[PDB]
RNA sequence: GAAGGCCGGGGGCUAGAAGGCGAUCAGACACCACCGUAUUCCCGGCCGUAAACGGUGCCGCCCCGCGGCCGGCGCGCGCGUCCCGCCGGCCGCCCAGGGAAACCGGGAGGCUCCGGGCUCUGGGGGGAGUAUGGCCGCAAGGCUGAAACUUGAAGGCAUUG
RNA sequence: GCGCUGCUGCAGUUGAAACGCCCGUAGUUGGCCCCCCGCCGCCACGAGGAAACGGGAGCGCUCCAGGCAGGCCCGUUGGAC
């Protein structure tokens, strides 16, 4: 059965980008997907998207502009100490200069740089670059 | 390794198929793996048909035929030149 | 006698119309003449090494027929590396063919900084991977002063390519030299085809060339 | 734009007619399928494609670097006339592999543009072109494979009437763009020449 | 454009980005090509010698679809309707 | 839960383990010819194994293109069991991609750029699916399942002769 | 060494390895949605509680392995954390 909506959405997006399309559809419209897409948009990877209501798990449309190379999830949400982030950074991202790791905290959804600035930790959702 | 995608038979959407017997050795073979040819021929061969017609009395008498189905196993078909061993590229051709 | 170019690129190179090899790489033109690379390297700055020499046999009606295969690399220790192979009945001609082929194909190696940006680049831009046969290679950026953490054979390639600090990981049957060198070569070749955000800037094309 | 003389020449040339089969990459150029099964193209779309291709061709300064390949015995005359009046190059007949990558071949050249009448008979050269950074333009029927095809011209490529007309129109347009012939006056050359005349 | 601590660039050269997929073109992408399209005078029939230039990567070319991408690009940069 | 096999009753034409007999052979108690018991068929009940194979676990998402067949539905017309689509199923070829390769491509893809959920199995070759225990079974046997000792290769796909 | 015990991070068509198939309990896993209330986990800070070892500030046992000294006009000389 369907479980991780975010994983299916990200996989569809990456497959569409690989053949250089411009528009995609994603059945689920969860809040977590919305925040993930908001962070992607603000950082400049996917530009625009819209949510299409239907009373039955609304659909969402997104636009592509290249740039994005990879994006995934971590299926069991680990717990990330505020001081234990460099190991995950090195293990997951290609370089320390660019890339964004998404953590969900008591202060909301943010990136590993922001949490490192506030010296707090939490749970990890995914990554992209 | 695998030599043929069909595994040497025509078996789709089933588990078991009825069996038959080879006509020259009487071996038991699955119906989807045996080699089949349909033939139609005259009872009297072609050289004596004219003599048969001249000796016949009925006017417009038509020579009756023979309708038979021959079934052979893999070993006997090869030994009697019913099929030929083909090259690796030519195994994928499916015309008569 | 003299070098009579057999190609439009060769003629343009003989003339002083083209001024840098980077001016060639930017448009992905195939190279067929070995004279083109010495013109840009008049003083023979490029190095050379012979990684391996193996003998291959073919069974025949009467005994065996033997042959020799050789692998060669070349680089100037500054962002340029090439790999090539050659096979012949005699060792020396095989080596000459391998050297010619290695010189023929050449690629630039992109380099970057680990954390602090001070001075010239000292390591690879980011994570790079290559695949040839069963062997896989991973190149990881490293801090300054870390040296080259790799086997002697791979370290030779990274030295001839002009790197100073890097971590490496290997997998598969690494005892097969050709495929290890090929995997590292492919990883290095991929370096300049990897998009990074600083290259997101939108540049209009140029009609000339 | 499209003029009555051109459309009438086309419909009497059976240029708008295609083939029973269709491809998902060529449905934009289709207007309707006849009851029998034959597909029908759009004349406006093909005319616009011809104009665009003519622009791309004239963008090349030296016409001698433009390649024309036609293994079809029907097109030989049209391609020869095309190169004669357009000062281009011809490779009629069999295409020797290595004509673009093997510098020791007697007929070795470094073209900048390649023209084809049908990939199925000429896609052997298309691969060669892909090896040497060469854009390609082709005449494509209703069903075709776009493998290294950059620009396609939807039209029938079997009947001589169709082939000669298309080449003649392309020559006319490129000449007009170059500035030799103004649009108002009809071109001195007739399409009947490009068509192979038996005996 | 990778800058140093002083903001000076240090990258050897900036390669090309495909006009359609915004993807980098490698030094060995031998199937990558670049074209140009002519601009036309107000009277027409004549060319101003200003050519808008495009480049498509090898992967998209093998995948097909270059034609439609070219059409949309032209309509974006040209009133070719 | 195939076939074979077992217990108790029926029935008894074909073929046919065992057995016998004639050839062939150096020998031939085997291949070939002939006769022929159990069995093969029915009822009730045990056994619980097969190359029980797609040698590919179940649920779920995205995915180049072409074509055939089966069932149901709908659309259009010039009404033909026409052609244009939808769902589900069985198939063939194949671009990318993957792989040691043969090859897969309705995944063996989206994976060293290496994290959707659940279950089971394996860790060089022999000894050995053996010994000793336990359970099931009328029995034949099935499930579970070592060690000592020995050994430097055994294997997979492909190339030339 | 060993990504040959694999959580990170193995393999399971052909090399060793998907139970013959179905049902099914413990067990594991479970679509979307409510703007602020209580509870569990979770993250951060804090208290409290032995030193040595380990990390680590300062001190030229002639250096060092070490030790907590030592200088004159020493933070209340110091031995912090
Ligand atoms: Mg065999
Ligand atoms: Mg079966
Ligand atoms: Mg039985
Ligand atoms: Mg099995
Ligand atoms: Mg893994
Ligand atoms: Mg193992
Ligand atoms: Mg063992
Ligand atoms: Mg096995
Ligand atoms: Zn028989």
Curated annotation (Swiss-Prot), chain D:
It comes from the Eukaryota. Keywords: Cytoplasm, Ribonucleoprotein, Ribosomal protein. One of its GO terms (cellular component) is cytosolic small ribosomal subunit. It is found in: Cytoplasm. One of its GO terms (molecular function) is structural constituent of ribosome. One of its GO terms (biological process) is translation. The keyword Disulfide bond does not apply. Component of the small ribosomal subunit. Mature ribosomes consist of a small (40S) and a large (60S) subunit. The 40S subunit contains about 33 different proteins and 1 molecule of RNA (18S). The 60S subunit contains about 49 different proteins and 3 molecules of RNA (25S, 5.8S and 5S). Interacts with ribosomal protein S21. Required for the assembly and/or stability of the 40S ribosomal subunit. Required for the processing of the 20S rRNA-precursor to mature 18S rRNA in a late step of the maturation of 40S ribosomal subunits. Belongs to the universal ribosomal protein uS2 family. This is Small ribosomal subunit protein uS2. It comes from Giardia intestinalis (strain ATCC 50803 / WB clone C6) (Giardia lamblia). The chain holds residues 14 to 212 of 245 of the full protein.
């Amino acid at each position: 059965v369907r479980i991780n909506v975010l994983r299916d959405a990200l996989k569809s997006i990456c497959n569409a980008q690989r053949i250089g399309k411009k528009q995609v559809i994603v059945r689920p419209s969860s809040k977590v997907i919305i925040e993930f897409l908001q962070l992607m948009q603000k950082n400049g990877y996917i530009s625009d998207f819209a949510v299409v209501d239907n009373h039955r798990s609304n659909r969402i449309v997104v636009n592509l502009i290249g740039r994005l190379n990879k994006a995934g999830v971590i299926s069991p949400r680990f717990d990330i100490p505020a001081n234990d982030i460099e190991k995950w950074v090195v293990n997951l991202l290609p370089s320390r200069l660019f890339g964004h790791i998404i953590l969900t905290t008591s202060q909301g959804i943010m990136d590993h740089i922001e949490a490192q600035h506030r010296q707090i930790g939490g749970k990890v959702i995914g990554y992209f670059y | 390794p695998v030599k043929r995608r069909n595994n040497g038979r025509s078996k789709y959407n089933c588990g078991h198929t009825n069996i038959v017997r080879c006509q020259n050795c009487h071996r038991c073979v699955p119906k989807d793996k045996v080699i089949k040819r349909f033939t139609i021929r005259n009872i009297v061969d072609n050289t004596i048909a004219d003599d048969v017609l001249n000796a016949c009395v009925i006017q417009g008498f038509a020579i009756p035929k023979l309708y038979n189905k021959v079934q052979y196993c893999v070993s006997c078909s090869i030994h009697n030149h019913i099929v030929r061993v083909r090259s690796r590229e030519d195994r994928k051709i499916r015309t008569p | 006698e003299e070098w009579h170019p057999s190609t439009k690129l060769g003629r343009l190179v003989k003339a002083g119309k083209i001024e840098s090899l980077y001016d060639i790489f930017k448009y992905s033109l195939p190279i067929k003449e070995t004279e083109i690379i010495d013109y840009f390297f008049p003083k023979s700055e490029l190095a050379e090494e012979v990684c391996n020499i193996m003998s291959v046999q073919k069974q025949t009606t009467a005994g065996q027929r033997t042959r020799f295969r050789a692998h060669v690399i070349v680089g100037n220790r500054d962002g340029f590396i090439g790999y090539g192979a050659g096979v012949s009945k005699e060792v020396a001609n095989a080596i000459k063919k391998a050297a010619k082929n290695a010189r023929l194909n050449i690629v630039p190696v992109r380099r970057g900084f680990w954390g602090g940006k001070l001075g010239d680049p000292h390591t690879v831009s980011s994570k790079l991977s290559g695949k040839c046969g069963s062997v896989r290679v991973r190149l990881i950026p490293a801090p300054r002063g870390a040296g080259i953490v790799a086997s002697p054979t791979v370290a030779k390639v990274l030295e001839f390519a002009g790197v100073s600090d890097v971590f490496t990981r290997q997998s598969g049957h690494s005892r097969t030299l050709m495929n290890s060198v090929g995997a590292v070569y492919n990883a290095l070749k991929s370096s300049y085809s990897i998009l990074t955000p600083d290259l997101w800037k939108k540049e209009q094309l140029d009609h000339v060339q | 734009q499209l003029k009555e003389a051109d459309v009438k020449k086309m419909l009497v040339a059976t240029t708008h007619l295609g083939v029973r089969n269709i491809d998902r990459r060529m449905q934009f150029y289709i207007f309707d399928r006849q009851k029998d099964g034959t597909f029908v193209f759009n004349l406006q779309k093909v005319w616009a494609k011809i104009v665009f291709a003519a622009r791309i061709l004239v963008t090349i300064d030296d016409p001698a670097e433009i390649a024309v390949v036609a293994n079809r015995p029907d097109a030989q005359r049209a391609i020869l006339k095309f190169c004669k009046y357009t000062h281009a190059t011809a490779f009629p007949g069999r295409f020797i592999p290595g004509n673009f990558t093997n510098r020791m071949n007697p007929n070795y050249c470094e073209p900048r543009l390649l023209l084809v009448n049908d990939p199925v008979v000429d896609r052997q050269a298309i691969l060669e072109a892909s090896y040497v950074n060469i854009p390609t333009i082709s005449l494509c029927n209703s069903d075709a494979n776009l493998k290294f095809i950059d620009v396609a011209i939807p039209c029938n490529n079997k009947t001589p009437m169709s082939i000669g007309l298309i080449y003649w129109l392309l020559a006319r347009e490129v000449l007009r763009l170059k500035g030799s012939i103004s649009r108002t006056e009809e071109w001195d050359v007739k399409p009947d020449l490009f068509v192979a005349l038996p005996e | 454009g990778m800058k140093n601590s002083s903001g000076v660039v240090v990258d050897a050269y900036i390669p090309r980005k495909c006009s359609a997929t915004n993807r980098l073109i490698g030094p060995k992408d031998h199937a990558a090509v670049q074209l140009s399209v002519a601009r036309v005078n107000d009277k027409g029939k004549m060319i101003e010698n200003n050519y808008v230039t495009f480049a498509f990567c090898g992967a998209i070319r093998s995948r097909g679809g270059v034609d439609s991408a070219f059409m949309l690009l032209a309509q974006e940069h040209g009133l070719m309707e």
